Amino acid sequence: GVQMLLTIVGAFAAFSLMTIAVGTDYWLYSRGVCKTKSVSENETSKKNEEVMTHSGLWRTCCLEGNFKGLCKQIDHFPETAEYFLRAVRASSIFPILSVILLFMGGLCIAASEFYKTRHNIILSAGIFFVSAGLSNIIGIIVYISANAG
Amino acid sequence: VTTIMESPYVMYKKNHEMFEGNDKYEGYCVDLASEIAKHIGIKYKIAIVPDGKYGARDADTKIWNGMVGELVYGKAEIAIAPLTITLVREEVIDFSKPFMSLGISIMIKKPQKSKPGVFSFLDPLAYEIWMCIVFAYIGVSVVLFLVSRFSPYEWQPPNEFGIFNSLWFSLGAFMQQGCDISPRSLSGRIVGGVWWFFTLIIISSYTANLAAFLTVERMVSPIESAEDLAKQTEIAYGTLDSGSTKEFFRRSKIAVYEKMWTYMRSAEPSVFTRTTAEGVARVRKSKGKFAFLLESTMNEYIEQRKPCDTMKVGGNLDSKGYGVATPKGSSLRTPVNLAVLKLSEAGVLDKLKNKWWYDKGECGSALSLSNVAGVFYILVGGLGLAMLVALIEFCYKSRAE
Amino acid sequence: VVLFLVSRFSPYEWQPPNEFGIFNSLWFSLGAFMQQGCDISPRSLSGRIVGGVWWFFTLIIISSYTANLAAFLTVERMVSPIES
Amino acid sequence: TTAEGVARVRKSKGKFAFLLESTMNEYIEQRKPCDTMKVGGNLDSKGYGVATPKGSSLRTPVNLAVLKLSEAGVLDKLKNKWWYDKGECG
Amino acid sequence: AEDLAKQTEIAYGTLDSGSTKEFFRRSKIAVYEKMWTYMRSAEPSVFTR
Numbered sequence: 001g002v003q004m005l006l007t008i009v010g011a012f013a014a015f016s017l018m019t020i021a022v023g024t025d026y027w028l029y030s031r032g033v034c035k036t037k038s039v040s041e042n043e044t045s046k047k048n049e050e051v052m053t054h055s056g057l058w059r060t061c062c063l064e065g066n067f068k069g070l071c072k073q074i075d076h077f078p079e080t081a082e083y084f085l086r087a088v089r090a091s092s093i094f095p096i097l098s099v100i101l102l103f104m105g106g107l108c109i110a111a112s113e114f115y116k117t118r119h120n121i122i123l124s125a126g127i128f129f130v131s132a133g134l135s136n137i138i139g140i141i142v143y144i145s146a147n148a149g
Numbered sequence: 150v151t152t153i154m155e156s157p158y159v160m161y162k163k164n165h166e167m168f169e170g171n172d173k174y175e176g177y178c179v180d181l182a183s184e185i186a187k188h189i190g191i192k193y194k195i196a197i198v199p200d201g202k203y204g205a206r207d208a209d210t211k212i213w214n215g216m217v218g219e220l221v222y223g224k225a226e227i228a229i230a231p232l233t234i235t236l237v238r239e240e241v242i243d244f245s246k247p248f249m250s251l252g253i254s255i256m257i258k259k260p261q262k263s264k265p266g267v268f269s270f271l272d273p274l275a276y277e278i279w280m281c282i283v284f285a286y287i288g289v290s291v292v293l294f295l296v297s298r299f300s301p302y303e304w305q306p307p308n309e310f311g312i313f314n315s316l317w318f319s320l321g322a323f324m325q326q327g328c329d330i331s332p333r334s335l336s337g338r339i340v341g342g343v344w345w346f347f348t349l350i351i352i353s354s355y356t357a358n359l360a361a362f363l364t365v366e367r368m369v370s371p372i373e374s375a376e377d378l379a380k381q382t383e384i385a386y387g388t389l390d391s392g393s394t395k396e397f398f399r400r401s402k403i404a405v406y407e408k409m410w411t412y413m414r415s416a417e418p419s420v421f422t423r424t425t426a427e428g429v430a431r432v433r434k435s436k437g438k439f440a441f442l443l444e445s446t447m448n449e450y451i452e453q454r455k456p457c458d459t460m461k462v463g464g465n466l467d468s469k470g471y472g473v474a475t476p477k478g479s480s481l482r483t484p485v486n487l488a489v490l491k492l493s494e495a496g497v498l499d500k501l502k503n504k505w506w507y508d509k510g511e512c513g514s515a516l517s518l519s520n521v522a523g524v525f526y527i528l529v530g531g532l533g534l535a536m537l538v539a540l541i542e543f544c545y546k547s548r549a550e
Numbered sequence: 551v552v553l554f555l556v557s558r559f560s561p562y563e564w565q566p567p568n569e570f571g572i573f574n575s576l577w578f579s580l581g582a583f584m585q586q587g588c589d590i591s592p593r594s595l596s597g598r599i600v601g602g603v604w605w606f607f608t609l610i611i612i613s614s615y616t617a618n619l620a621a622f623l624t625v626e627r628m629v630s631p632i633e634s
Numbered sequence: 635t636t637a638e639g640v641a642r643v644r645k646s647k648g649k650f651a652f653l654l655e656s657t658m659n660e661y662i663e664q665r666k667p668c669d670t671m672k673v674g675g676n677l678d679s680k681g682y683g684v685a686t687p688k689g690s691s692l693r694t695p696v697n698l699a700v701l702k703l704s705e706a707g708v709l710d711k712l713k714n715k716w717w718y719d720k721g722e723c724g
Numbered sequence: 725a726e727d728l729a730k731q732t733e734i735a736y737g738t739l740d741s742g743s744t745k746e747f748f749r750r751s752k753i754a755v756y757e758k759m760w761t762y763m764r765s766a767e768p769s770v771f772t773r
């Protein structure tokens with residue numbers, strides 16, 4: 001009764017934090033570009049003004065500059081091992097698989113009270129949470145191992 | 150206005166077939182002509198030199214050929230081109246002050262960031278060693294099981310060294326971890342002892358060869374001088390045949406440069422190329438083993454063009470300049486000379502240099518997680534596998550009941 | 551966490567089958583990483599898998615630290631704050 | 635003064651960069667205590683030259699004397715002699 | 725000799741009166757010319773007696 005509250009509260013907190021991480025664009029503070037190439041406009045001919053940015057998983061944005069707030073969509077595939085890593089970082093399957101496993105975890109906890117004799121539902125919850133953390137580990141490594149190329 | 154077709158100085162427009170007059174061309178010298186003309190209030194007409202040569206002396210019939218000949222013989226009144234200022238030309242025409250200082254630099258194939266592979270933690274040892282360790286591991290474990298549990302005069306088991314446990318002991322011995330049981334018998338202790346000695350050498354060798362790798366990759370120094378190339382004999386520096394860059398080394402009295410000239414004269418195969426396009430290709434088509442000696446202006450252009458596999462290194466070996474030229478006895482000499490000094494103070498010569506060599510370009514200590522990424526994937530993979538194993542057992546037993 | 555799970559979750563082993571609780575599992579992983587000892591070792595296939603990968607991961611990391619530290623102490627490269 | 639700016643660079647322990655001409659920046663880099671050097675490339679293109687009175691008959695001969703010494707290599711040997719050979723850093 | 729010329733820790737030194745000083749003064753070799761330059765203006769005077 002009192003140990004399930006921490007489990008329920010923790011599961012919500014973890015799912016909430018992982019949905020706001022995946023959804024927001026404050027994963028990295030780099031110094032790149034956030035606007036498409038101004039071919040005709042010739043604002044800077046080709047290479048625009050590199051300014052401080054805040055990147056995420058899908059969109060890059062600009063803190064300072066005359067384009068403050070413009071958010072381009074990160075282009076992963078530019079121009080085997082490298083290609084596979086770029087297909088896993090682009091889709092963000094592991095940061096999104098964690099979300100799905102954190103969600104399934106809480107579903108089991110919800111089901112753990114409408115069926116108080118099926119003890120194998122609480123075990124499934126725990127496995128989903130442990131597995132969700134494992135996916136988070138992979139996602140973090142994949143994300144960091146991609147930004148270094 | 151005599152001019153020569155060279156990039157990025159002069160280039161045909163994207164659709165110059167639907168254009169007539171001075172608008173058919175574009176480039177640094179086309180913009181420069183517009184800047185110079187308006188400052189001196191003159192009207193010009195761009196006209197490419199028919200021969201395509203810069204300006205040389207036949208040395209026989211003593212007839213100047215090229216842009217210089219197009220000025221001495223009164224065929225043009227202003228030569229807005231990358232025409233180098235030289236003494237031999239100064240005796241027949243009067244150049245203006247240089248609008249672009251340059252020299253002889255070094256071009257090498259731009260290197261790669263060498264993104265570490267995923268399973269690069271295995272690099273200190275060869276694939277054969279890693280494969281043989283697995284074979285040795287299996288053999289030791291089997292022999293540890295053979296000598297410990299075969300004798301029927303000791304059996305309740307005489308110890309806890311079964312096949313599953315023999316594998317566990319050997320695995321923890323290699324990693325220098327583990328507790329639990331150690332062999333109590335003579336033969337079993339002989340297996341343990343040699344396996345422990347084998348582990349001690351291999352683990353020390355891995356650490357010692359990883360340190361060697363990290364230290365020698367930390368001692369590498371990029372080449373940033375002509376002297377470095379002269380000392381080295383792996384990469385083959387090369388110039389051209391017809392032009393200054395070959396005369397410079399031939400007449401050079403500097404020891405650092407004299408040795409290079411000697412080499413190139415008798416080296417085989419002949420490093421002396423013919424066309425600049427051929428040269429710039431050789432360096433790329435050699436995987437960082439050729440070095441081209443060309444002008445610092447051309448080098449900084451190539452570097453900013455695709456496939457972006459070239460870069461500028463070191464510093465200029467000499468100091469030359471490009472100056473606008475005019476016939477002798479003309480009247481534009483002074484207005485043009487002042488026009489080139491006005492376009493420099495105002496920064497219009499650096500704006501045009503950035504505009505064409507950059508703005509209109511195309512090429513734009515600690516261990517990282519990429520260096521140990523693979524061992525992180527194995528760990529999480531092993532954690533997932535262990536979870537899979539534990540559940541399958543659970544499921545099997547649960548079904549039975 | 552994984553070591554704790556694979557060791558104590560099954561009810562068909564329990565009084566406790568081993569000492570690998572959450573507190574002890576943290577101690578085991580710490581001792582393994584620090585290259586020190588082994589108060590308890592997993593005796594089950596699933597548990598031993600966790601130990602083996604952790605022992606391999608540790609080995610690489612500890613060797614990498616020592617190897618990269620030696621490189622630092624050998625070659626002393628100076629960083630120029632300004633290059634342009 | 636230039637000497638002030640140089641001095642402000644050693645006193646600041648590395649929290650001040652002096653923007654001066656390249657030729658002078660490559661003279662103080664070769665003089666003791668040997669704690670100052672040059673970084674980056676030239677931000678501008680300016681040239682030292684030899685001046686003569688307007689209308690003088692020595693204009694053209696001087697123009698060809700300077701140009702000849704550059705092709706020969708004397709102007710480069712002279713610089714390396716009084717900048718690096720007479721240096722004190724190494 | 726080239727190693728000494730590159731190095732600035734150890735101070736090479738000749739004599740004043742004799743060949744060994746004339747040799748560096750008249751030397752046209754770059755590896756030797758730099759050493760002569762140094763010794764001429766270096767302080768304290770490396771030239772012994």
Ligand SMILES: CCCCCCCC/C=C/CCCCCCCC(=O)OC[C@H](O)CO
Pocket residue numbers: 268313316317320527598599602603606
């Ligand atoms: C009964 C006791 C045993 C229990 C079992 C415990 C497992 C321990 C294994 C750890 C090392 C495994 C590391 C595997 C490394 C694979 C490397 C790989 O994939 O190869 C690189 C690739 O070829 C690039 O070209």
Ligand SMILES: CCCCCCCC/C=C\CCCCCCCC(=O)OC[C@H](O)CO
Pocket residue numbers: 338339342343346
């Ligand atoms: C109490 C029972 C303890 C256990 C008992 C067994 C333990 C074995 C341990 C190490 C063997 C290492 C042997 C190393 C021999 C090196 C070979 C050698 O001497 O080589 C000379 C060389 O060839 C000249 O050029």
Ligand SMILES: NS(=O)(=O)c1cccc2c1c([N+](=O)[O-])cc1[nH]c(=O)c(=O)[nH]c12
Pocket residue numbers: 155203204231232233234391392393425443444446447
């Ligand atoms: N483009 S290049 O391949 O490097 C090149 C190669 C060979 C001769 C060149 C030359 C260039 N250039 O740089 O434009 C300018 C230039 N100007 C002169 O007056 C002259 O005599 N020869 C040249």
Ligand SMILES: CCCCCCCCCCCCCCCC(=O)O
Pocket residue numbers: 101120123124127128131540543544547
């Ligand atoms: C595709 C996602 C893979 C990673 C996550 C996998 C988690 C699987 C958990 C399944 C339930 C395990 C417990 C079942 C108990 C039982 O019914 O015996």
Ligand SMILES: CCCCCCCCCCCCCCCC(=O)O
Pocket residue numbers: 271272275276279280282283286319320323324606
């Ligand atoms: C206890 C003995 C074995 C310990 C585990 C060692 C893990 C390495 C084995 C796999 C590596 C095989 C090498 C192929 C990849 C390569 O280096 O090219």
Ligand SMILES: *C(=O)CCCCCCCCCCCCCCC
Pocket residue numbers: 097127130131132134135533534536537540541543544
């Ligand atoms: C009986 O067989 C019950 C079902 C067994 C499920 C086995 C899989 C459990 C999870 C292991 C892998 C976790 C990976 C986490 C990162 C994606």
